[PDB]
Amino acid sequence: SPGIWQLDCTHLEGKVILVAVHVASGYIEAEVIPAETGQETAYFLLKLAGRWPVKTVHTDNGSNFTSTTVKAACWWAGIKQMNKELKKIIGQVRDQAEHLKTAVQMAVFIHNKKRKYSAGERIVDIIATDI
């Protein structure tokens, strides 16, 4: 179903990477964050919700969504309640960038553009079809 996303954090090089997966297509977005915090999670959700029609969000760590900040983002935005593949791509491209965050965006790009349609095409098709 088109309005469902999963959100989790992973760790790499002593930093945190927030990873959202659009479950039906396999499309991802990701950001490197200072801290695994309610505030970064909330902020990220607001950005996500402005781009795609986000209806529900799931996570593998339910305590992620406990803060007042997250609940306030989900309320305002109307929302209700690849780790290893991505780390694989990141490791393939890692020597070509100085900052981890650059390598992560490189790996998101590679992941979303790779064919079997690509995840980036699937999301847009799934969402356009649902309009």
Residues binding ligand LF0 (CB under 6 A): 39, 42-43, 46, 68-69, 72-73, 76, 96-99, 102, 106
Alpha carbons within 13 A on the beta-carbon side of 39:
3
Q: How far is the CB of 115 from ligand LF0 (least distance, A)?
A: 21
Measured from the CB atom, the residue of 25 and 44 that comes closer to ligand LF0 is 44
Q: Which is nearer to Mg ion, 16 or 97 (CB)?
A: 16
Amino acid at 108: V
Write out the residues near Mg ion by the rule CB under 5 A: 8-9, 61
Task: Pick between residue 12 and residue 97 the one whose CB is nearest to its own copies.
Answer: 97
Q: Widest CA span of the chain, in angstroms? A: 41
Alpha carbon of 94 to those of 2, 12, 103, 105, 109: distances in Å?
A: 32, 12, 6, 11, 14
Binding site partner of 98, from its own copies, ligand LF0, Mg ion, none, Cβ cut-off 5-8 A by kind:
ligand LF0
Residue 91 touches which member of ligand LF0, its own copies, Mg ion, none, C-beta under 5-8 Å by kind:
none
**Minimum distance from CB of 85 to its own copies (Å)?**
15
Tokens representing 105? 């965006």
Query: Could you tell which of ligand LF0, its own copies, Mg ion, none binds residue 11, using a CB distance below 5 to 8 A set by kind?
Result: none
Q: Which long-range contacts (CB under 8 A, 24 or more apart) does 23-26 make?
A: 23/58, 24/122, 24/123, 24/126, 25/119, 25/122, 25/123, 25/126, 26/82, 26/119, 26/122
